[PDB]
Amino acid sequence: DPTVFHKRYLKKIRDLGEGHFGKVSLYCYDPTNTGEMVAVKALKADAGPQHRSGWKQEIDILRTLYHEHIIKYKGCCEDAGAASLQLVMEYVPLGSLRDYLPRHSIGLAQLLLFAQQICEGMAYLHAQHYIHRDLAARNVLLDNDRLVKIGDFGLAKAVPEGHEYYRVGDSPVFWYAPECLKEYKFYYASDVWSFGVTLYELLTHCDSSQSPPTKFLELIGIAQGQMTVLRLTELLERGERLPRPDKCPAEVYHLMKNCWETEASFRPTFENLIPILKTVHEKYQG
Ligand SMILES: CC(C)(C)c1nc2c3ccc(F)cc3c3c(=O)[nH]ccc3c2[nH]1
């Protein structure tokens, strides 16, 4: 059953973040009056046809998802001037792990709990026959209780019923498995590769000097898209991998490497990752 927010009662507070197709801002929704704080995401200015269709897909997908570790869809708002809907979501005031981790002292057990929660949301997503396609620390958000909420479903897709992959502008190539780069196939297992990269980001505390783009660009250089993807594919097929983060346990690095098996069918499922991460979280907790 639909929920409609009325622009007449939305009062902008501040900007929060920029995703693939939309910008997110904080609003007070006050049909009285104070009222509820909500996040509102709107189609970016100068959006072309391809962007409007991506944006429509994002709203359609998020409208169907309902889980403790997926950012909560609240409703939509019409913007008649844009001829487009605006997406209203819960407000999660700690923002993304990309912005949070560099600014706080966080232990290994906490990082592994974040990872477990990411796997729980992703196991749910895959249950529902969607792939995310940009599973990266920038898109993992934290609520006031530091509970993980996966966000930015801008690239997400329904995997055609009867299949284990979706056949695929600017892609987040430094988070992508070789089959995505080379075969233009995005499997459920391709999101698991991306999770491995995200886990690497968590263990490096989202330090920019250690980031996946920094590490790969050191080897590939700035180049055109096609050349970048070719060079990246070659490195990955030859077994090149992101290094073990300082202070990362051997078994946690082995977990990353398993998520980065070149052959997709050898990677763990998100369902299996849940108890694996639970186990290592408890181990390093006490
Ligand atoms: C970059 C991206 C599109 C993933 C994004 N950033 C935020 C965000 C950043 C800081 C903050 F305090 C809140 C949010 C936020 C939010 O509160 N709700 C929904 C999405 C979202 C968000 N979505």
Quote the strand ranges of the chain, DSSP E: 10-18, 22-29, 36-43, 73-79, 84-89, 130-131, 140-142, 148-150, 157-158, 165-167, 185-187
CA 166, 168, 171, 175 dihedral sign is positive
Contact call for residues 122 and 74 (beta carbons, < 8 A): no
The CB of 35 under 6 Å from ligand 1? The reply is: no
68 phi/psi in degrees, rounded to 5: -60, -25
100 with 114, same domain?
yes
20 marked ligand binding residue: yes
User: Residue 48 and residue 53: Cα distance in Å, rounded?
Assistant: 9
The CB of 24 under 6 Å from ligand 1? The reply is: yes
166 with 186, same domain?
yes
User: Residue 186 and residue 202: Cα distance in Å, rounded?
Assistant: 23
User: Residue 180 and residue 165: Cα distance in Å, rounded?
Assistant: 10
Experimental method: X-ray
Q: Which residue reads 């993980």 in tokens? A: 148
Q: Quick count: other Cβ atoms within 10 Å of Cβ 56?
A: 14
DSSP code of residue 112: H
Which residues are CB-neighbours of 277 under 8 A, at least 6 positions away?
112, 113, 115, 116, 119
101 with 53, same domain?
no
80 with 109, same domain?
no
CA 263, 165, 148, 155 dihedral sign is positive
The helix/strand/coil state of 122 is helix
Asked which of 60, 91, 122 is the last residue of a domain, the reply is 91
123 with 257, same domain?
yes
Number of domains in the chain: 2
For residue 240, give the nearest of 217, 265, 262 by alpha carbon: 262
Task: Record the tokens describing residue 115, joined without a space.
Answer: 């990872």
Query: Distance from the CA of 92 to the center of ligand 1, in angstroms?
Result: 7
Strands 148-150, 130-131: pairing is unpaired
194 with 261, same domain?
yes
140 with 73, same domain?
no
Q: Quick count: other Cβ atoms within 10 Å of Cβ 34?
A: 9
As a whole number of angstroms, the longest Cα–Cα distance in the chain is 62
| Ligand 1 probe mutation, 28, 59, 96, 206, most atoms within 8 A of CB | 96
Bond from prior residue into 33 cis (ω within 30 degrees of 0): yes
Contacts within 8 Å (CB) and 24+ apart, 181-188 = 181/229, 181/232, 181/233, 181/236, 182/233, 182/237, 186/131, 186/133, 186/157, 187/131, 187/264, 188/126, 188/131, 188/159, 188/164, 188/269, 188/270
Please state the atom number of ligand 1 nearest to the C-alpha of residue 91: 17
Query: Distance from the CA of 151 to the center of ligand 1, in angstroms?
Result: 7
Query: Distance from the CA of 16 to the center of ligand 1, in angstroms?
Result: 6
The CB of 95 under 6 Å from ligand 1? The reply is: yes
Query: Distance from the CA of 40 to the center of ligand 1, in angstroms?
Result: 9
- Sequence letter at residue 32: T
C-alpha 115 chain-centroid distance: 12
Strands 140-142, 148-150: pairing is antiparallel
Residue numbers of the domain that contains 249: 92-286
Q: Which residue reads 């997926």 in tokens? A: 70
Task: Record the tokens describing residue 18, joined without a space.
Answer: 């920029």
How would you list the strands of the sheet with 36-43, edge to edge? 10-18, 22-29, 36-43, 84-89, 73-79
Total H helices, total E strands in the chain: 9, 11
Quote the strand ranges of 80-184, DSSP E: 84-89, 130-131, 140-142, 148-150, 157-158, 165-167
234 with 130, same domain?
yes
Asked which of 64, 91, 118 is the last residue of a domain, the reply is 91
22 marked ligand binding residue: yes
The CB of 135 under 6 Å from ligand 1? The reply is: no
Task: Record the tokens describing residue 204, joined without a space.
Answer: 């490096």
User: Residue 177 and residue 191: Cα distance in Å, rounded?
Assistant: 8
CATH number at residue 194: 1.10.510.10
Catalytic residue among 1, 15, 30, 134: 134
Task: Record the tokens describing residue 227, joined without a space.
Answer: 């050349």
Q: How large is the angle between the packed helices 188-203 and 212-220, nearest 10 degrees?
A: 100
The CB of 93 under 6 Å from ligand 1? The reply is: yes
CATH number at residue 8: 3.30.200.20
User: Residue 273 and residue 255: Cα distance in Å, rounded?
Assistant: 9
Q: How large is the angle between the packed helices 270-285 and 250-259, nearest 10 degrees?
A: 170
Please state the atom number of ligand 1 nearest to the C-alpha of residue 71: 19
The CB of 139 under 6 Å from ligand 1? The reply is: yes
C-alpha Rg value of the chain to the nearest Å: 19
78 with 164, same domain?
no
Q: Which residue reads 């966000």 in tokens? A: 151
The helix/strand/coil state of 228 is helix
240 with 163, same domain?
yes
17 marked ligand binding residue: yes
217 with 127, same domain?
yes
Active site (annotated) includes residue 170: no
Asked which of 91, 106, 135 is the last residue of a domain, the reply is 91
74 with 216, same domain?
no
Which residues are CB-neighbours of 207 under 8 A, at least 6 positions away?
102
